[PDB]
Amino acid sequence: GACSDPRANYDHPEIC
Secondary structure, three states: OHOOOOOOOOOOOOOO
8 A cells, every 4th residue: 555655645554
């Protein structure tokens, strides 16, 4: 997922 994307990452999605 956004693990390698700082854009999709919300204010607090998940610690990868």
